[PDB]
Design a protein around this motif. Structure first.
Motif, PDB file in Angstrom:
ATOM      1  N   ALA A  74     -31.768  26.343  16.056  1.00  0.00           N
ATOM      2  CA  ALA A  74     -30.515  26.449  15.321  1.00  0.00           C
ATOM      3  C   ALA A  74     -29.916  25.073  15.061  1.00  0.00           C
ATOM      4  N   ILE A  75     -29.860  24.222  16.090  1.00  0.00           N
ATOM      5  CA  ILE A  75     -29.152  22.963  15.921  1.00  0.00           C
ATOM      6  C   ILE A  75     -29.905  22.018  15.001  1.00  0.00           C
ATOM      7  N   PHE A  76     -31.216  22.193  14.843  1.00  0.00           N
ATOM      8  CA  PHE A  76     -31.987  21.329  13.958  1.00  0.00           C
ATOM      9  C   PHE A  76     -32.279  21.964  12.609  1.00  0.00           C
ATOM     10  N   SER A  77     -31.843  23.205  12.388  1.00  0.00           N
ATOM     11  CA  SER A  77     -32.098  23.872  11.116  1.00  0.00           C
ATOM     12  C   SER A  77     -31.362  23.213   9.953  1.00  0.00           C
ATOM     13  N   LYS A  78     -30.338  22.400  10.229  1.00  0.00           N
ATOM     14  CA  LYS A  78     -29.661  21.673   9.159  1.00  0.00           C
ATOM     15  C   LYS A  78     -30.612  20.753   8.399  1.00  0.00           C
ATOM     16  N   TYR A  79     -31.679  20.283   9.044  1.00  0.00           N
ATOM     17  CA  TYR A  79     -32.662  19.418   8.381  1.00  0.00           C
ATOM     18  C   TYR A  79     -33.548  20.265   7.471  1.00  0.00           C
ATOM     19  N   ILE A  80     -33.006  20.592   6.294  1.00  0.00           N
ATOM     20  CA  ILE A  80     -33.652  21.559   5.406  1.00  0.00           C
ATOM     21  C   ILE A  80     -34.801  20.977   4.601  1.00  0.00           C
ATOM     22  N   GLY A  81     -34.992  19.668   4.617  1.00  0.00           N
ATOM     23  CA  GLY A  81     -36.035  19.035   3.836  1.00  0.00           C
ATOM     24  C   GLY A  81     -35.490  17.967   2.908  1.00  0.00           C
ATOM     25  N   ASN A  82     -36.415  17.348   2.185  1.00  0.00           N
ATOM     26  CA  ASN A  82     -36.116  16.300   1.228  1.00  0.00           C
ATOM     27  C   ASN A  82     -36.655  16.706  -0.136  1.00  0.00           C
ATOM     28  N   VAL A  83     -35.929  16.362  -1.186  1.00  0.00           N
ATOM     29  CA  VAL A  83     -36.508  16.350  -2.522  1.00  0.00           C
ATOM     30  C   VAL A  83     -37.020  14.935  -2.757  1.00  0.00           C
ATOM     31  N   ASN A  84     -38.290  14.813  -3.083  1.00  0.00           N
ATOM     32  CA  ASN A  84     -38.916  13.501  -3.225  1.00  0.00           C
ATOM     33  C   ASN A  84     -38.907  13.163  -4.707  1.00  0.00           C
ATOM     34  N   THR A  85     -37.948  12.336  -5.114  1.00  0.00           N
ATOM     35  CA  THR A  85     -37.808  11.966  -6.513  1.00  0.00           C
ATOM     36  C   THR A  85     -37.367  10.515  -6.587  1.00  0.00           C
ATOM     37  N   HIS A  86     -37.520   9.940  -7.773  1.00  0.00           N
ATOM     38  CA  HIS A  86     -37.027   8.608  -8.063  1.00  0.00           C
ATOM     39  C   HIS A  86     -35.548   8.677  -8.427  1.00  0.00           C
ATOM     40  N   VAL A  87     -34.894   7.522  -8.392  1.00  0.00           N
ATOM     41  CA  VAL A  87     -33.525   7.424  -8.890  1.00  0.00           C
ATOM     42  C   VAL A  87     -33.566   7.609 -10.408  1.00  0.00           C
ATOM     43  N   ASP A  88     -33.081   8.752 -10.896  1.00  0.00           N
ATOM     44  CA  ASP A  88     -33.294   9.099 -12.296  1.00  0.00           C
ATOM     45  C   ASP A  88     -32.159   8.568 -13.173  1.00  0.00           C
ATOM     46  N   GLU A  89     -32.228   8.878 -14.478  1.00  0.00           N
ATOM     47  CA  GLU A  89     -31.283   8.307 -15.437  1.00  0.00           C
ATOM     48  C   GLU A  89     -29.851   8.750 -15.169  1.00  0.00           C
ATOM     49  N   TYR A  90     -29.667   9.970 -14.672  1.00  0.00           N
ATOM     50  CA  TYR A  90     -28.325  10.441 -14.364  1.00  0.00           C
ATOM     51  C   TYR A  90     -27.759   9.710 -13.156  1.00  0.00           C
ATOM     52  N   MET A  91     -28.589   9.487 -12.128  1.00  0.00           N
ATOM     53  CA  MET A  91     -28.141   8.732 -10.958  1.00  0.00           C
ATOM     54  C   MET A  91     -27.765   7.307 -11.328  1.00  0.00           C
ATOM     55  N   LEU A  92     -28.565   6.666 -12.190  1.00  0.00           N
ATOM     56  CA  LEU A  92     -28.297   5.279 -12.559  1.00  0.00           C
ATOM     57  C   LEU A  92     -26.944   5.148 -13.241  1.00  0.00           C
ATOM     58  N   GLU A  93     -26.639   6.056 -14.170  1.00  0.00           N
ATOM     59  CA  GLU A  93     -25.334   6.000 -14.822  1.00  0.00           C
ATOM     60  C   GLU A  93     -24.212   6.348 -13.849  1.00  0.00           C
ATOM     61  N   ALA A  94     -24.445   7.306 -12.945  1.00  0.00           N
ATOM     62  CA  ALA A  94     -23.440   7.621 -11.922  1.00  0.00           C
ATOM     63  C   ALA A  94     -23.128   6.398 -11.058  1.00  0.00           C
ATOM     64  N   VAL A  95     -24.168   5.694 -10.598  1.00  0.00           N
ATOM     65  CA  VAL A  95     -23.969   4.486  -9.795  1.00  0.00           C
ATOM     66  C   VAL A  95     -23.188   3.450 -10.590  1.00  0.00           C
ATOM     67  N   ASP A  96     -23.595   3.208 -11.846  1.00  0.00           N
ATOM     68  CA  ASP A  96     -22.884   2.233 -12.676  1.00  0.00           C
ATOM     69  C   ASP A  96     -21.410   2.584 -12.802  1.00  0.00           C
ATOM     70  N   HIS A  97     -21.106   3.863 -13.040  1.00  0.00           N
ATOM     71  CA  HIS A  97     -19.724   4.243 -13.291  1.00  0.00           C
ATOM     72  C   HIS A  97     -18.874   4.069 -12.040  1.00  0.00           C
ATOM     73  N   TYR A  98     -19.377   4.528 -10.894  1.00  0.00           N
ATOM     74  CA  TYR A  98     -18.608   4.394  -9.663  1.00  0.00           C
ATOM     75  C   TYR A  98     -18.487   2.928  -9.255  1.00  0.00           C
ATOM     76  N   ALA A  99     -19.563   2.153  -9.438  1.00  0.00           N
ATOM     77  CA  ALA A  99     -19.529   0.722  -9.134  1.00  0.00           C
ATOM     78  C   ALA A  99     -18.451   0.005  -9.935  1.00  0.00           C
ATOM     79  N   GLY A 100     -18.277   0.392 -11.201  1.00  0.00           N
ATOM     80  CA  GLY A 100     -17.233  -0.213 -12.010  1.00  0.00           C
ATOM     81  C   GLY A 100     -15.843   0.036 -11.455  1.00  0.00           C
ATOM     82  N   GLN A 101     -15.608   1.239 -10.915  1.00  0.00           N
ATOM     83  CA  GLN A 101     -14.343   1.505 -10.228  1.00  0.00           C
ATOM     84  C   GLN A 101     -14.190   0.603  -9.012  1.00  0.00           C
ATOM     85  N   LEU A 102     -15.204   0.587  -8.146  1.00  0.00           N
ATOM     86  CA  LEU A 102     -15.106  -0.188  -6.916  1.00  0.00           C
ATOM     87  C   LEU A 102     -14.985  -1.677  -7.197  1.00  0.00           C
ATOM     88  N   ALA A 103     -15.501  -2.142  -8.342  1.00  0.00           N
ATOM     89  CA  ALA A 103     -15.365  -3.557  -8.685  1.00  0.00           C
ATOM     90  C   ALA A 103     -13.901  -3.959  -8.804  1.00  0.00           C
TER      91      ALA A 103
END
Length: 462
Positions: free
Chosen positions: A57-86
């Motif tokens: 039960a206590i380790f069932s939270k480790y449901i797995g990983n999706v193995n993917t690259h940082v995709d185009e949506y993630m890149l724009e998300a990072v850019d947008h949030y980074a601009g705020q934090l800048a």
């Protein structure tokens, strides 16, 4: 996150970590005066209340990983949030050791009552054997950091806390993953100025509520979140995180000016080594809840996640009109047009996240200021000063808390802290709470603030 390897600690030369197996929680003097259903979390395999296998039960939270690259949506998300934090001019210079250990504005002193982690817990060496509030001594700490180094195993503890009937039966106790004192200090040096900036700037530029004071902050939230509300819970957020989200976090940190080397500590969080009682194990992914910065890093990742999902489902979205505030997994957000949170949640499943929108569900066809919650609290505008907003912790949760104690010697502090939450439910509710408290002799030995005093101090605080 996914457990990649587990074996008996003795095979690797680690001693058994002797962690608490019996709850410190006992029924308080108020246990019969108030009603409640919660009980101490299961701490050990042999607990007779278990209706499931505890270790699974206590380790069932480790449901797995999706193995993917940082995709185009993630890149724009990072850019947008980074601009705020800048906008915040975060310093990537190391924080001074004394400031990072003994306290500075925006970063409270390292907690001396929590675990010092490995190897100190195997040597009977406590945080107070190394550190001293009175002297601010750094001599022993420098010796210990030189002697044992960094990238040490984390020690897994079962969190001793009240849980629902269902979570007791299912054995779904939460785990606390204690970084070694060495790694906590090193991370606080590396990221301390980032921590400071986040703590001093809760709101929609950091997208963070970490460190906020709800008594003050909740009146600001509806000013910041102008549009149609969006809100989410996650199931097992921390442990569901796949390495790709840590890669996004490292990309954001580098855009803030951190070197690749300074972002190496994110690998320590992502690909992590843990000791649990007589076993040791490695996890790929998963935020190890309890290490330095995990609430702030969880919050930063959530800012990347939600933006990613919006960009992927609503290709026409304008993130400059999006606003959000996260505290770890908890999110409250707004957009000037309605957004189908169920589409975002399904998109999140493709990224290995388990999301439940705050709306239906049911009983909630639309998230409003009447029914939305954040940090377990509702929002109620004051009837007399409509621009001030009460954070409203449900009385049921206050009743659950008051019925147990980990040490009756702290009763006065415990009840007073609950009074500071309770009075936001209204004067009649508070008077009844106080009456019930005073129906036990202890209750008449406590200094309890009057309602009018709490209200007057709250109004004056603005």
């Amino acid at each position: 996150g996914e457990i990649e390897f587990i074996e008996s600690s003795k095979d690797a030369g680690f001693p058994v970590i002797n962690t608490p197996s019996k709850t410190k929680l006992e029924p308080s003097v108020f246990h019969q005066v108030f009603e409640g259903n919660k009980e101490p979390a299961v701490l050990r395999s042999g607990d007779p209340r278990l209706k499931a296998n505890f270790e699974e039960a206590i380790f069932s939270k480790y449901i797995g990983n999706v193995n993917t690259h940082v995709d185009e949506y993630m890149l724009e998300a990072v850019d947008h949030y980074a601009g705020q934090l800048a906008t915040l001019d975060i310093s990537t210079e190391p924080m001074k050791l004394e400031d990072a250990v003994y306290g500075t504005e925006g970063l409270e002193a390292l907690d001396l009552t929590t675990s010092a982690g490995y190897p100190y817990v195997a040597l009977g060496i406590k945080k107070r054997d190394i550190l001293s509030k009175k002297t601010k001594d750094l001599t022993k700490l420098k010796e210990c950091m030189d002697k044992y180094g960094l990238n040490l195993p984390m020690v897994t503890y079962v969190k001793d806390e009240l849980r629902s009937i269902e979570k007791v039966a299912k054995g779904k106790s939460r785990l606390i993953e204690a970084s070694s004192l060495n790694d906590s200090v090193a991370m606080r040096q590396t990221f301390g100025n980032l921590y400071k900036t986040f703590h001093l700037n809760p709101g929609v530029v950091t997208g963070s509520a970490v460190g906020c004071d709800p008594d003050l902050f909740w009146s600001k939230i509806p000013v910041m979140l102008d549009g149609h509300l969006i809100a989410f819970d996650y199931s097992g957020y921390d442990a569901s995180l796949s390495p790709v989200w840590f890669a996004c976090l490292k990309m954001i940190l580098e855009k803030l000016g951190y070197t690749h080397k300074e972002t190496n500590y994110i690998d320590y969080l992502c690909n992590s080594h843990h000791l649990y009682r007589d076993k040791h194990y490695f996890v790929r992914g998963g935020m190890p809840s309890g290490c330095s910065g995990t609430s702030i890093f969880n919050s930063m990742i959530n800012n990347i996640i939600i933006r990613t999902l919006m960009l992927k489902v609503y290709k026409g979205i304008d993130l400059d009109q999006f606003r959000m505030i996260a505290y770890g997994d908890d999110v409250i957000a707004s957009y000037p047009w309605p957004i189908d949170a169920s589409l975002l949640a399904e998109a999140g499943k493709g990224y290995g996240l388990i999301m439940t929108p705050a709306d239906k569900g049911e009983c909630i066809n639309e998230v409003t200021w009447t029914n939305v919650t954040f940090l377990k609290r509702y929002f109620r505008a004051d009837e007399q000063y409509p621009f001030l907003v009460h954070p409203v912790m449900p009385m049921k949760d206050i009743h659950e808390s008051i019925r147990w104690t980990k040490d009756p010697k702290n009763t006065q502090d415990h009840v007073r802290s609950l009074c500071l939450l309770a009075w936001h439910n209204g004067e009649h509710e508070y008077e009844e709470f106080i009456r019930k408290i005073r129906s036990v002799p202890v209750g008449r030995c406590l200094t309890l603030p009057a309602f009018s005093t709490l209200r007057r101090k709250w109004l004056d605080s603005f």
